[PDB]
Design a protein around this ligand. Structure first.
Ligand SMILES: [Ca+2]
Length: 579
DNA sequence: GCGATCAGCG
DNA sequence: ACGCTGATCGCA
């Protein structure tokens, strides 16, 4: 129904200096995945190319790698990475419809061309799920059906660039697309393709030791419970705790008794078994998610894991990381932290370098709220998390453990993002009356933060959305909801999203500036991971001293705020040691 | 497939 | 009854 040329060879009119390009990778994880078909739409017509002909054609490969031949695409990182796995470089992507839709409205959840096109009343393209099917039925359709689908997707991109750019421009987001998110997409593609090397010998030894400890603890649990059961069965775990042993019920779920860690910790005075259950779960989590789960996704020939950073998923502008998630590798308990010993440089005599913004969202908050006291604190480079731990636990600076400071961190963020006296009292195991007074004291020291929390909710009501420093946007329809509980969740989103989102904007700019600086200095150092406000690199040991000066400076100077930004950084033989 | 749970970032 | 996530697991 849509006209196109099913081409048998590449012709010069397919190699124009502006085109919509589709390089179709159907598998969810695009690492080392098949490219099933290619479509090109430009001024001269519409073309479908089989990958075996197009990607072996030297002129088509050259066109893909020529940055002066501009391509408009949807999810260009998926294409870039799949092409890297084919030994082909993609350059010249000047418009990514996925990132444009994400910026316009992240709540749309746009995950294919059809969903983006619907934002602009364009419906002459099918959803990918209607074409490929779902689950066990998923399959590449017959070539004529595939070709028309890929051509229709390219035609949609070709038509949709201008109205998406026009709305981006009206939102003050066109530079956010072109100078931040699209350059970041190329950097993430390099990081994902580079991967992180894993010490599978050490990981597997840890797993064998874990399984022994797990059985020991499992037996002591059966013995403390007087009987055996399925320690992961709620119905059975609930029976043991809250019926057999008759422990108090502090919380319910929609489905029954709650056994979350906060509940178990409050029951520790009543019975030894709850601490064993906690230890059992923590070891099991390491075993299932971080030993077995990681070994599953290691590529055996290179011993590398290749995450996918989802750049158009979170509602605040953060990235997320999937299969494996390398943004939640354990660190806080020593037993879990040892997992990071398995993350190693990819070459001999290279090292891992990790750099982290200090108290990033409080510094962003001080800038946006213009709170005199919070700005003065960071101008003094005070550690507000430590200062809050001193006050909470009534200790001196010297006595603050990493654990008190971790807890004080949740108090600081809890309060500025709208925690109630009830929530605070439950977190600190303190009186509700004390919790409320401490919150009141907190806002006496930082009245500008209070004013900002009030103003930003009003602004979200008037405008219908909130923005970040670099003009990311999040619509909050529920902020005028008549339902108190629904309105309240929206109000805490108005409080949090501009801060968490501006911190996401800053580190993204930092990554672009860092990559350019590393290229300027002709260093071999390169990014491996981003963990929200931390950057993890690897480099030859001979570059470490230059990186100690280069990286903190690039990160500190990415933006200029009313308070300084501050970067902590370490390096070492494994990720474990980069602290 | 979903809810609880828990690993991380703030 | 602070916010943003992803993986595993049992299923009340
Ligand atoms: Ca930090």
């Amino acid at each position: 129904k849509m006209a196109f040329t099913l081409a048998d060879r590449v012709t010069e009119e397919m190699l124009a200096d502006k085109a919509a390009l589709v390089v179709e990778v159907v598998e969810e994880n695009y690492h080392d995945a098949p490219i099933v078909g290619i479509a090109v739409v430009n001024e001269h017509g519409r073309f479908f190319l089989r990958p075996e002909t197009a990607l072996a054609d030297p002129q088509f490969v050259a066109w893909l790698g020529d940055e002066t031949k501009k391509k408009s695409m949807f999810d260009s990182k998926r294409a870039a990475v799949a092409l890297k796995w084919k030994g082909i470089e993609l350059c010249g992507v000047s418009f990514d419809l996925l990132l444009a839709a994400y910026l316009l409205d992240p709540a749309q959840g746009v995950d294919d061309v059809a969903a983006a096109a619907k934002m602009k009343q364009y419906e002459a393209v099918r959803p990918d799920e209607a074409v490929y099917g779902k689950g066990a039925k998923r399959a590449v359709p017959d070539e004529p059906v595939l070709a028309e689908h890929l051509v229709r997707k390219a035609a949609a991109i070709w038509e949709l660039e201008r109205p998406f750019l026009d709305e981006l421009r009206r939102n003050e987001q066109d530079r956010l697309l072109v100078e931040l998110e699209q350059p970041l997409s190329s950097i993430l593609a390099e990081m994902e393709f580079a991967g992180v090397k894993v010490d599978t010998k050490r990981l597997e030894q840890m797993g064998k030791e874990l399984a022994e400890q797990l059985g020991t603890v499992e037996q002591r649990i059966y013995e403390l419970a007087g009987q055996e059961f399925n320690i992961n069965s709620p119905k059975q775990l609930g029976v043991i705790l809250f019926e057999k042993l008759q422990l108090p019920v502090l919380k319910k779920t929609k489905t029954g008794y709650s056994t979350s860690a906060d509940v178990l910790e409050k029951l520790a005075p009543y019975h030894e078994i709850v601490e064993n259950i906690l230890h059992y779960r923590q070891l099991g989590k390491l075993q299932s998610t971080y030993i077995e789960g990681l070994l599953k996704v290691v590529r055996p020939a290179t011993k590398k894991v290749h995450t996918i950073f989802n750049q158009a998923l979170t509602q605040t502008g953060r990235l997320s990381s999937t299969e494996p998630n390398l943004q939640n590798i354990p660190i806080r308990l020593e037993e879990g932290r040892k997992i990071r010993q398995a993350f190693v440089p990819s070459e001999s005599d290279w090292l891992i370098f990790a750099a982290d913004y200090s108290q990033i969202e409080l510094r962003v908050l001080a800038h946006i709220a213009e709170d005199d006291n919070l700005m003065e604190a960071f101008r003094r480079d005070l550690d507000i998390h430590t200062k809050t731990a001193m006050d909470i636990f009534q200790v001196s600076e010297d006595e603050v453990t990493p654990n008190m400071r971790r807890q004080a961190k949740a108090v600081n963020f809890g309060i500025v993002y709208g925690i109630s006296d009830y929530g605070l009292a439950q977190n600190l195991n303190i009186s509700r009356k004390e919790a409320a007074e401490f919150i009141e004291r907190y806002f006496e020291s930082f009245p500008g933060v209070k004013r900002y929390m009030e103003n930003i909710v009003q602004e979200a009501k008037q405008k219908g959305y909130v923005t970040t420093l670099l003009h990311r946007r999040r619509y909050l329809p529920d902020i005028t909801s008549r339902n108190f509980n629904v309105r309240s969740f929206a109000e805490r989103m108005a409080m949090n999203t501009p801060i968490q989102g501006s911190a996401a904007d800053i580190i993204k700019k930092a990554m672009i500036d860092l990559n350019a600086r590393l290229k300027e200095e002709r260093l071999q150092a390169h990014l491996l991971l981003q963990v929200h406000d931390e950057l993890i690199l690897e480099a030859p040991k001979e570059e470490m001293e230059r990186l100690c000066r280069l990286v903190p400076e690039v990160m500190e100077q990415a933006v200029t705020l009313r308070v300084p930004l501050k970067v902590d950084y370490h390096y070492g033989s494994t990720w474990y040691d980069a602290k």
